[PDB]
Design a protein around this ligand. Structure first.
Ligand SMILES: OC[C@H]1O[C@@H](O[C@H]2[C@H](O)[C@@H](O)[C@@H](O)O[C@@H]2CO)[C@H](O)[C@@H](O)[C@@H]1O
Ligand SMILES: OC[C@H]1O[C@@H](O)[C@H](O)[C@@H](O)[C@@H]1O
Ligand SMILES: [Ca+2]
Ligand SMILES: [Co+2]
Ligand SMILES: [Co+2]
Ligand SMILES: [Zn+2]
Length: 528
């Protein structure tokens, strides 16, 4: 029995909460580390078993001891409590880099040499192609276009919204070209570069992924991974999402790397050429390939987002004719990796008003506000104030939560100022850092119960106990979709369906598109 809390810390001027299982109010206090009480209040019921205690009113920085009943926690208040973790979460992208010596001076004990430096064969052909660079997608060493788009979109958004917060963190600066860009753009460029090499010049279509034919053992170092590299065929989802991320890149990078911006801009346009000339054909792994499929039956949300990004890239009202039908559909307005419409909503909402119907705009904004209300209701009745239900705890549930925090915060950039927006962000951070039923901090390297054994091949195959730090784990998943979860977790409530085990890929993997919205949400809070 113990206190559950934000194990990274709290912002001075931010919202401060802890939890305990109780059956009644209890008083609590916080004292300076060497004795003297600074704050007292009473816990209050929040649902099921849970009592919370709020100490937002404590604005003096420090490490404090929090006592309730006979229990004690060490809680930290600081002006920028999350600067470190945010830096870690950004640096994870640099740790995921493919085909570049990650030097000890930047990597520390998790340094390594270039991996996957060979060419890839276009599936069922004798053509080689170089697709070097970018990120290992997750626990494996694949690089997959579709999930890659979310990660790039997320980080460019983080820059566009929270450049101040991001300014105070440092990526692995010496592995990136000079001149150095603002951290998010600097990390992002690596993946943008790789993605450019996935577009077939013949057609403008984009290859769905480059992977070996199957996963190596968990105990494979990146540099030891010898298996040949295969490009799975061009896919509509790959092409559409590529188009969306490049169009966005064209905008954000224009003042920073104009050669890149222009080039992305035209990459985006050629992909949209492709989309028009081809059928919305879901991707399926071809025979022989057994690595992540990243499939999707519904491809209209992807068209939405490509269209809306080209709308916002050009500024040309022409594009409004294609977007506004797509915006009218009953697609779910989510932030990826498969259901990507909400990225299109923002691109459209953040296109200048001259180019789009004020009428549609307001309907879009109306629907947006109604969706946030739904999420707020979920938060209202959840004991930890997060906008989730038990059925929402699926593979990557931390991304689900974070994508939803992210929704409120992006909405503030488009005059949809929901009153729950900043309470929900704080809560999502709290949870992610250990304010949950397992008391589990879901980022490697932080808090008092950090993630120790991630399903991450580098963390497994190096012989360093501590895993690469800064990695956000998928989180609890009630579907029990690996043999280890089935073993230990059958019968546990949804939020407890998580095990810190290296074989639990359905609950304990890491992914560039799980870190990406985390970066955005934490970034948002730092900018307090
Ligand atoms: O389709 C199952 C889940 O896949 C998840 O992405 C995987 C990917 O498929 C693997 O190849 C590897 O890269 O690990 C990833 C994360 O565990 C995806 O995020 C889930 O939503 C899917 O349900
Ligand atoms: O099905 C997906 C999973 O399969 C496992 O064999 C791999 O180790 C994981 O990295 C992968 O995500
Ligand atoms: Ca889709
Ligand atoms: Co290790
Ligand atoms: Co070994
Ligand atoms: Zn690699």
């Amino acid at each position: 029995k113990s206190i559950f809390y934000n194990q990274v810390g709290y912002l001075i001027s931010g919202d401060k909460r802890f939890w305990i299982q109780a059956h009644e109010p209890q008083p609590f206090a916080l004292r300076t580390p060497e004795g003297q009480a600074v704050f007292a209040g009473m816990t209050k019921p929040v649902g099921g078993n849970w009592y919370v205690g709020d100490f937002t009113a404590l604005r003096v920085p420090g490490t404090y001891t929090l006592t309730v009943g006979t229990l004690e926690a060490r809680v930290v208040i600081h002006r920028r409590a999350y600067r470190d973790v945010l830096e870690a979460m950004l640096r994870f992208f640099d740790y995921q880099l493919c085909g570049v010596v990650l030097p000890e001076d930047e990597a520390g004990p998790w340094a390594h040499g270039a991996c996957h430096t060979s060419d890839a064969k276009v599936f069922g052909t004798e053509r080689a192609l170089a697709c070097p660079g970018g990120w290992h997608d997750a626990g494996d060493y694949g690089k997959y276009t579709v999930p890659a788009a979310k990660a790039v979109a997320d980080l460019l958004l983080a820059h566009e919204y929270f450049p101040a917060a991001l300014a105070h963190v440092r990526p692995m600066r010496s592995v990136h070209r000079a001149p150095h860009l603002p951290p998010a753009l600097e990390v992002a460029r690596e993946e943008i570069a790789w993605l450019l090499t996935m577009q077939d010049p013949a057609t403008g279509g984009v290859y769905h992924k480059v992977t070996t034919p199957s996963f190596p053992p968990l105990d494979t170092r990146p540099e030891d991974d010898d298996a040949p590299l295969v490009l799975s065929p061009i896919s509509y989802a790959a092409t559409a999402t590529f188009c969306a991320a490049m169009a966005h890149a064209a905008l954000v990078y224009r003042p920073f790397d104009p050669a890149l911006s222009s080039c992305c801009a035209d990459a985006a346009r050629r992909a949209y050429a492709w989309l028009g000339a081809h059928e919305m054909q879901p991707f399926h792994n071809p025979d022989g390939i057994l690595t992540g499929e990243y499939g999707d039956a519904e491809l209209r949300d992807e068209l939405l987002w490509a269209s809306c990004a080209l709308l916002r890239m050009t500024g040309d009202s022409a594009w409004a004719r294609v977007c506004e039908p797509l915006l009218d559909l009953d697609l779910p307005w989510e932030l990826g990796w498969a259901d990507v419409a909400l990225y299109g909503v923002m691109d459209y909402l953040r296109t200048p008003r001259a180019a789009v119907s004020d009428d549609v705009r307001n309907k879009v904004k109306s629907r947006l506000l109604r969706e946030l209300d739904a999420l707020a209701a979920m938060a209202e009745s959840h004991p930890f104030g997060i906008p989730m239900r038990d059925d929402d705890f699926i593979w990557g549930s931390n991304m689900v939560l974070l994508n939803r925090a992210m929704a409120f915060l992006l909405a503030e950039g488009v005059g949809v100022l929901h009153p729950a927006a900043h309470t929900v962000a704080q809560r999502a951070a709290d949870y992610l850092f250990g304010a949950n039923p397992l008391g589990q901090c879901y980022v490697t390297g932080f808090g008092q119960r950090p993630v120790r054994h991630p399903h991450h091949r580098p963390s497994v195959a190096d012989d360093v106990d501590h895993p690469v730090p800064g990695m956000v784990v998928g989180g609890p998943n009630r579907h029990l979709q690996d043999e280890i979860a089935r073993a230990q977790l059958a019968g546990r409530p949804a939020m407890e369906a998580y095990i810190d085990h290296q074989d639990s890929y359905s609950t304990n993997e890491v992914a560039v598109y799980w870190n990406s919205p985390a970066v955005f949400v934490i970034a948002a809070l730092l900018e307090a």
